[PDB]
Write a protein that binds this ligand. Structure first.
Ligand code: FES
Ligand SMILES: [Zn+2]
Ligand SMILES: [Zn+2]
Ligand SMILES: [Zn+2]
Lengths: 19, 55, 61, 82, 96, 256, 91, 63, 62, 211, 107, 138, 98, 256
RNA sequence: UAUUAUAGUGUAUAGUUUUUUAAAAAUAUAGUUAAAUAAAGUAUGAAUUAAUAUCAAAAUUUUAAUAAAAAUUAAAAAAUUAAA
């Protein structure tokens, strides 16, 4: 979950950028 | 994950002490002299009087 | 997940390294390391012109 | 009078709607493909509630055909050849 | 010195006298910060009071010590005052 | 109580990492015996005074019944009848001697739940055939009770045996032992007197005799009339030679 | 870090803490040479606020450019005309 | 792969190959709609799966 | 009477408090959406500089 | 990884001396002189007065307390001196014997047949000294007289300086603490025995320098 | 490397920087859309004017050949007949305000 | 569980850290330091790191048969005032030997004396550089 | 000190109640029409169901914040497909309008 | 001689301190006011959960900044004592008042305006206060989210405080962007003009309508993500209206 | 509603805004020689498995292949965590 949270946050940032 | 359990094998946990401490505990409390609400010692409100003097 | 980013007081060098945002005066090394499509770093404009040619000719002479 | 987007647009000789589109996401003000949350889409009128629509719950985020045609789509006359 | 507990004692005074030797260059006019247990706050308050030297600190009085330690917020002002009082006379003799 | 730690030096160039233990108000709190059985005589000694509100009700009741001033801690010592001292007696640090041997019982510092690498970390036969004559063996069908395994390592009643005494300071009631304990500051250590060593007896005419039953200070002396440096008893050297070098027998050349 | 006025080129040094991470590459400040609020561009790194664990303070190290700038502004030759005006150690 | 019954209400695990199914996020059980499905019913107007057909004839008659 | 009122309508520990649900005009909200405080657990904190003006001197968030 | 950077001391900067001289013999001799030197900040206290109030309240009345004590001890005005006001720690868990411990109402020598001490009776303390020329016997007599007068004042409380101190000033404790014998009897300095003639010579030198 | 240190040379853009092709001033205060190349000397181009002065097309290799004070693309300069580009014609694909040229410089 | 590892007896669970204020630890330690001074195993010292760093120290270790005589600098000092919990670092350099050693005070056999009344930080720096080079080469 | 607790065989093993053959109760004609709840001892002065719109807010408040419900406004499967109803719903429709 | 356990060894969470001589390594000068190491040892502040020490430092900075902005802050879990100690350190910096101290506080905090506010008011506010400047009450209401104890961390001497005087925090104001409630007997107080202007500028942002659109969009976002009790953006209503604006303007004029 | 930008074109300061928690084991990352992150608990709640009587301490001996199958002998507490 440790690295998974950071990965999910980065994915959310990328999705917000691409939306 | 190898064999089914029977009611007594399940009730061993309630026989134990950890189950009672985790589930079957009664809290000691009193009526706060200021707000007259149920209250446990060591925990108070955010009201000004409670913050200044802690019942 | 890097030690430098984990340090309680992030160093200025690491901060600059992380400063890879696509903006004016952003780090060029990180953008170049990133994929070409992701960034917008295009070919370096150079002047293969008469004045440089003359300068090189003078130096060669 | 601290600062206003309309005042800045007037000072710079720009369109307030254009400034709003610039400073708000592209999908809201232009005919472009972008994620839209289902709640924004709205729902009809239920027995104990009135109808909901983007035109009433997000008037500012609505698209603008005038600006979209001015900026994105070409004009046929500007390229007409004959 | 700095570790003195509660009151000061002849043991601490003798310790200060012994270390006077280890501090040769000290003069009665030396800056107050050399005093043991004189913190930044204490020396700032002494400067505000216009006390600038060990001689003046020793020349202070009980009322000034009390108003420094209990109204100016200084801590261990009694300790620094005792240090200065115990050390001034050897310093004066050294200066002479 | 374990007061602090320091470093001292022998008459030779030997350095000892001494642990200084503070002995607060100590008194014989109780006498016990299991129906008069021989050898069961025990003396319970207090450690340090304490307010009334400090202890639990039953501990306070025990001290009230004893009549001795309330003590934070109370230890017990099996003794012989001749060694009895009246309840309420005052014990001074001079009860011991600078050079004797003391048994130290204390609680180790708690390291919590640790793995095998930390505790028991290094990183018989039942039945088997020595010759190929036959085939008979007995394999291991379970975990034997003695099996070094991960568990709670830490707090535990440890007991150093025969630690020599190094220095007694009866003005401040301190005893310095030339060793370092794996215990936290403030632990109530228990000091006993080692009874033998290397086939000999600690107390004897060759070495000396103790203040049996305990040390009773004289009347004229007043500890409040003595300085801290006038009330210290240093032990004779524990080693015979300078441990940096070798004994003169094993030494190539000696200066004398 | 060193920050240089976009137009003037006047350079000033100021270490940046973690609280101002998004203002290292670019800044906005009142340049002295031009009496207007101007953009400042990052040029070199001086040293982080605080220190990393279990290392001396200056382990990250100022950049060579920052060291050269500081030497030019406070060196023997630079200090010679001014040191006479007032000893840099005292008043 | 397959361990319990083929119906969605069966408890134990299934696999896509043997018992392929549609993505039913949350549907009632053998004992009738639960509080969660009923909350979906009242808020969204239908069960979250969407495959169910809304039927509030009794509510209409009542009100 | 005050004791009974406190027992009934008193803010219980773990529920019916300012951290469990916050009653807006007529609606229940989670504590994070409470419009009565932009605490560290409030969504209002994460907003800032909508486009009009900076509105705050701090330059790290918002 | 060295603790000190190259600029820990300013470049080309002098450093102050930290010992008298490099010669061990003269260093030891100076150490002996200083160790055998008499204490200069030592002042035996005539009597330690104590109040149940706080320092921020007693500082105002400090001068009045001094005048009242001088009147009580029947001495010329201004003859007595007051040491720094010392507020004893507000210990949650009382610990008798510590210098910063609120003095109790009584003592075992006063009530031997008591199963506990009387509650706290002093949270701030202040030493009272006389002229240094006063003899030890005179100091003891003055302290005992003051203690007796204050005890009588308290007892009758349960005009005169004692009554004024007890009622107005508020002091409710006074003691005559033992002498500070923590001083060192330097019979050997640096491993060299201190001869009686040498000690007398050092004392004479210090007396001459002081005079 | 990144952020080419400019201590020795401040690397500032004068207000009166003239476009290398159309010979008109550049106002860096308004926008940074212009194209700057230090090459430390200094070259300035308008984004539109960056095209070859002869064929008015982009530069395939992003390199030009100054001639008579004007920038001519490599084909035109070398004499090979200009071949019309396919991907794009009137641009240059260069990055504005030295961003495409900050890679090289003095350190 | 045939054995136990933790003790919950009051005697062991009790701690006297609350009552520790009754005994002055610092005064006792300073008295021990003064006793060492009187015995002569060490002399009092009140120096700061800036003042002492780089000062020359002569070390006479009374080994046998020939006492060891060394001259070095002061790389570091543990404490700034006389105390048993002290210690001082030295960098002795013989003909072909470069030994950096920590010497504690109060030892009757290791007579270490700072032979100068002051030290030079530049000397400390260059000596430290020499030691670093020697250590790296080794 | 502690509350008495006993694991319930009812929760351990709860077989389904017997079904009806041909929707026939075997002893309907033999038993009274009294409510089996009343004759067994189960009675309620105020029955409350949390599945109602009135108690929806109470149910939501009781539910913990951490448990999340996703398809609050949209749905995965398209809901504008002409599909059938449940058998009991169809039977109710037929009975209501035969 | 060497101790039994050699080297820096991690002990139990609640373990005593032993003076055994061991080489001590500290990451930096922990004595610095705002640069304090986080750990479960007694000499360190408690380390509340974070994704990294850098994230913990960021959380500490945010908490301190919020405390300065509004003295009272409600923080959950182990971060409450850390926030209290950091607030005390900030007060110490303000009382010191040195330029270096101010620059250090500027480095630490996120808001230079709050740095200035602290260095302006805290000196006079805590001139008479010695050590403890922040109080930490414990709230009997635990966060429903993760059931973590909540602590009300507050500054002391509010009466001496200039910009925060007569503020009662028994209940927050009607809107988070409105000035905090004022005691009835302290209704005539007037805040510093600079802080008042800063607060007004901050509140205007929320008074804008684009904030209302953002609020409705947040309703939509949470509804999509899964937060249950998020009313539909059709039913939600703006936080700020014209009648409410004029009523609150009258209230602000009355309070001054 | 997932590792995860679908990139054609195209551009470079829009802060274009959802990742709990007060320790420890284990696991993953992280001045000799050739110290960070992931807890229980509140809340939600799967999966392999399931002949089994409230269960099979242990040793000895033996019976048709592991034999907790048999017999003899003996003495096996409950809960919690970890350990193959
Ligand atoms: S009134 Fe009861 S907690 Fe405050
Ligand atoms: Zn400028
Ligand atoms: Zn041009
Ligand atoms: Zn061309």
């Amino acid at each position: 979950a440790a690295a998974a949270a950071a990965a999910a946050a980065a994915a959310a940032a990328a999705a917000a950028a691409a939306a | 994950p190898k064999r089914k359990k029977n009611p007594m094998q399940l009730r061993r946990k309630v026989y134990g002490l950890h189950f009672k401490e985790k589930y079957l505990k009664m809290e000691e409390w009193y009526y706060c002299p200021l707000c007259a609400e149920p209250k446990k010692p060591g925990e108070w409100c955010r009201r000004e009087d409670c913050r200044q003097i802690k019942p | 997940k890097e030690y430098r980013l984990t340090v309680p007081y992030r160093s200025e060098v690491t901060m600059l390294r992380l400063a890879n945002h696509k903006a004016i005066n952003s780090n060029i090394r990180e953008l170049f390391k990133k994929p070409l499509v992701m960034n917008n770093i295009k070919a370096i404009p150079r002047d293969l012109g008469e004045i440089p040619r003359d300068y090189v000719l003078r130096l060669l002479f | 009078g601290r600062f206003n987007m309309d005042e800045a647009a007037a000072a710079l000789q720009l369109n307030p709607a254009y400034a709003a589109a610039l400073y708000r996401p592209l999908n809201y003000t232009f005919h472009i493909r972008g994620q839209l949350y289902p709640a924004q889409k709205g729902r009809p009128s239920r027995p104990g509630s009135l109808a909901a629509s983007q035109g009433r719950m997000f008037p500012l985020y609505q698209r603008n055909d005038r600006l979209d045609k001015e900026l994105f789509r070409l004009n046929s006359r500007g390229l007409t050849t004959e | 010195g700095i570790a003195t507990g509660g009151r000061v004692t002849n043991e601490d005074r003798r310790w200060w006298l012994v270390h006077l030797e280890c501090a040769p260059d000290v003069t009665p006019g030396t800056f107050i910060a050399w005093l043991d247990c004189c913190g930044t706050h204490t020396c700032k308050k002494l400067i505000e009071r216009n006390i600038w030297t060990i001689e003046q600190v020793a020349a202070l009085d009980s009322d000034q010590v009390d108003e420094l330690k209990y109204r100016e917020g200084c801590l261990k002002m009694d300790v620094v005052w005792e240090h200065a009082r115990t050390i001034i006379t050897p310093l004066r003799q050294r200066e002479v | 109580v374990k007061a602090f730690t320091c470093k001292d030096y022998d008459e030779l160039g030997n350095q000892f990492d001494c642990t200084a233990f503070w002995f607060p108000d100590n008194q014989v709190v109780k006498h016990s015996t299991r129906n008069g059985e021989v050898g069961t005589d025990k003396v319970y000694v207090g450690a340090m005074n304490v307010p009334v509100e400090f202890h639990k009700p039953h501990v306070a009741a025990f001290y009230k019944a004893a009549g001795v001033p309330v003590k934070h801690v109370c230890a017990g010592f099996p003794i012989t009848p001749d060694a009895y001292a009246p309840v309420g007696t005052k014990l001074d640090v001079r009860h011991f001697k600078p050079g004797q041997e003391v048994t130290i019982t204390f609680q180790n510092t708690d390291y919590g739940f640790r793995g095998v690498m930390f505790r028991h970390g290094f990183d018989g036969d039942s039945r088997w055939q020595r010759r190929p004559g036959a085939m008979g063996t007995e394999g291991q069908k379970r975990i034997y009770p003695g099996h070094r395994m991960a568990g709670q390592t830490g707090a535990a009643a440890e007991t150093y045996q025969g630690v020599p005494v190094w220095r007694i300071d009866y003005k401040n009631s301190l005893i310095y032992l030339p060793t370092l304990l794996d215990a936290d500051v403030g632990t109530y250590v228990r000091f006993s007197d080692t009874i033998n060593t290397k086939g000999l007896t600690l107390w004897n005419e060759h070495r000396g005799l103790p203040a049996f039953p305990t040390f009773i200070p004289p009347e004229d002396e007043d500890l409040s009339k003595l300085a801290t440096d006038e009330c210290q008893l240093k032990s004779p050297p524990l080693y015979m030679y300078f441990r940096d070098e070798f004994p003169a027998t094993q030494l190539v050349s000696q200066a004398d | 870090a060193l920050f240089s006025c976009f137009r003037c080129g006047y350079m000033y040094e100021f270490a940046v803490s973690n609280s101002y991470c998004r203002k290292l590459t670019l800044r906005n400040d009142h340049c002295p040479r031009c009496d207007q609020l101007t953009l400042f561009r990052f040029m070199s790194v001086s040293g982080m606020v605080g220190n990393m664990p279990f290392k001396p303070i200056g382990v990250p190290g100022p950049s060579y450019a920052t060291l050269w700038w500081r030497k030019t502004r406070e060196g023997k030759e630079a200090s010679a005309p001014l040191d006479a005006v007032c000893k840099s150690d005292r008043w | 792969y397959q361990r319990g019954g083929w119906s969605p209400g069966s408890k134990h695990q299934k696999h896509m190959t043997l018992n392929p199914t549609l993505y039913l996020y949350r549907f009632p059980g053998p004992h009738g709609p639960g509080p969660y499905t009923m909350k979906y019913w009242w808020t969204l107007g239908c069960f979250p799966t969407g495959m169910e057909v809304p039927f509030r004839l009794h509510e209409f008659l009542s009100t | 009477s005050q004791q009974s009122r406190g027992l009934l309508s008193g803010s219980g520990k773990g529920f019916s408090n300012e951290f469990d649900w916050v009653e807006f005009k007529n609606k229940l909200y989670p504590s994070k959406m409470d419009p009565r405080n932009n605490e560290m657990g409030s969504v209002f904190r994460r907003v800032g500089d909508l486009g009009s003006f900076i509105s705050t001197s701090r330059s790290m968030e918002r | 990884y060295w603790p000190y950077n190259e600029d820990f001391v300013p470049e080309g900067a002098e450093t102050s001396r930290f010992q008298s001289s490099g010669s061990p013999g003269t260093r030891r001799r100076v150490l002996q002189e200083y160790a055998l030197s008499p204490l200069f900040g030592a002042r035996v206290p005539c009597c330690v007065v104590g109040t149940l109030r706080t320092a921020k309240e007693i500082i105002v009345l400090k001068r009045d307390i001094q005048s009242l004590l001088c009147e009580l001890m029947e001495l010329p005005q201004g003859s007595v001196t007051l040491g720094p006001l010392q507020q004893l720690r507000e210990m949650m868990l009382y610990r008798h014997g510590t210098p910063l411990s609120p003095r109790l109402g009584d003592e075992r020598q006063l009530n031997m047949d008591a199963y506990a001490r009387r509650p706290i009776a002093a949270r701030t303390m202040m030493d009272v000294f006389l002229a240094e020329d006063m003899s030890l016997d005179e100091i003891v007599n003055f302290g005992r007289l003051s203690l007796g007068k204050l005890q009588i004042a308290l007892n009758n409380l349960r005009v005169e300086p004692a009554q004024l101190l007890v009622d107005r000033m508020g002091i409710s404790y006074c003691e005559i603490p033992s002498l500070d014998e923590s001083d060192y009897v330097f019979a050997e300095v640096g491993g060299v025995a201190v001869t009686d003639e040498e000690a007398e010579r050092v004392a004479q030198r210090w007396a001459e320098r002081c005079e | 490397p990144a952020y080419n240190e400019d201590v020795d040379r401040p690397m500032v853009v004068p207000p009166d920087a003239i476009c290398f092709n159309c010979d008109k001033p550049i106002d860096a205060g308004d926008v940074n859309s212009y194209v700057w190349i230090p090459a430390g000397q200094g070259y300035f181009f308008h984004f539109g004017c960056f095209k070859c002065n002869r064929c008015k097309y982009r530069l395939g290799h992003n390199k030009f050949y100054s001639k008579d004070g004007k920038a001519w693309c490599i084909p035109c300069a070398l004499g090979r007949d200009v071949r019309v580009p396919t991907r794009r014609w009137h641009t240059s694909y260069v990055n504005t305000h030295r961003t495409g040229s900050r890679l090289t410089g003095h350190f | 569980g045939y054995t136990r590892e933790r003790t919950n007896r009051h005697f062991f669970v009790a701690r006297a850290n609350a009552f520790f204020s009754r005994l002055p630890i610092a005064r006792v330690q300073r008295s021990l330091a003064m006793e060492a001074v009187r015995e002569g195993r060490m002399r009092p010292w009140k120096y700061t790191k800036e003042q002492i760093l780089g000062a020359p120290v002569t070390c006479n270790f009374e080994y046998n048969p020939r006492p060891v005589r060394l001259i070095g600098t002061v790389m570091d000092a543990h404490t700034e005032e006389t105390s048993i919990k002290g210690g001082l670092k030295v960098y002795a350099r013989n003909e072909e030997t470069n030994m950096m050693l920590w010497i504690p005070p109060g030892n009757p056999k290791l007579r270490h004396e700072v032979t100068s009344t002051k030290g030079s930080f530049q000397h400390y720096l260059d000596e430290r550089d020499k030691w670093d080079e020697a250590w790296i080469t080794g | 000190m502690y509350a008495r607790f006993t694991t319930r065989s009812k929760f351990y093993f709860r077989p389904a109640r017997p079904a009806l053959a041909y929707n026939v109760d075997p002893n309907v004609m033999r038993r009274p029409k009294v409510k089996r709840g009343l004759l067994k001892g189960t009675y309620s002065d105020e029955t409350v169901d949390l599945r109602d719109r009135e108690r929806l807010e109470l149910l939501e408040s009781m539910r913990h914040p951490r448990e999340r419900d996703f398809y609050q406004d949209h749905t995965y499967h398209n809901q504008w497909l002409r599909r059938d109803l449940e058998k009991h719903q169809k039977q109710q429709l037929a009975a209501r309008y035969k | 001689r060497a101790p039994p356990v050699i080297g820096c060894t991690r002990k139990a969470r609640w373990a005593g301190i032993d003076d055994n001589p061991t080489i001590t390594y500290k990451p930096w000068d922990t004595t610095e006011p705002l640069m304090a190491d986080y750990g479960w040892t007694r000499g360190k502040l408690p380390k509340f959960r974070a994704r990294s020490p850098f994230h913990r430092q960021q959380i500490a900075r945010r908490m301190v900044t919020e405390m300065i902005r509004k003295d009272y802050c409600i923080v959950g879990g182990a971060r409450a004592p850390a926030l209290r100690i950091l607030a005390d350190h900030v007060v110490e910096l303000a009382k010191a008042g040195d330029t270096d101290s101010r620059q250090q506080l500027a480095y630490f905090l996120h808001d230079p305006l709050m740095v200035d506010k602290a260095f302006d008011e805290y000196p006079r506010r805590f001139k008479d206060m010695n050590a403890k400047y922040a109080m930490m009450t414990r709230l009997k209401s635990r966060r429903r989210t993760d059931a973590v104890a909540m602590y009300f961390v507050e500054y002391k001497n509010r009466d001496m405080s200039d910009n925060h005087k007569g503020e009662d925090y028994s209940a927050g104001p009607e809107r988070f962007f409105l000035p905090p409630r004022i005691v009835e007997t302290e209704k005539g107080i007037q805040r510093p003009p600079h802080m008042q202007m800063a607060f007004d500028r901050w509140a205007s942002k929320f008074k804008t309508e684009e904030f209302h659109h953002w609020w409705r969009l947040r309703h939509a976002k949470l509804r999509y993500w899964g937060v249950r009790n998020v009313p539909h953006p059709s039913d939600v209503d703006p936080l700020w209206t014209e009648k409410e604006e004029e009523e609150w303007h009258n209230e602000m004029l009355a309070n001054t």
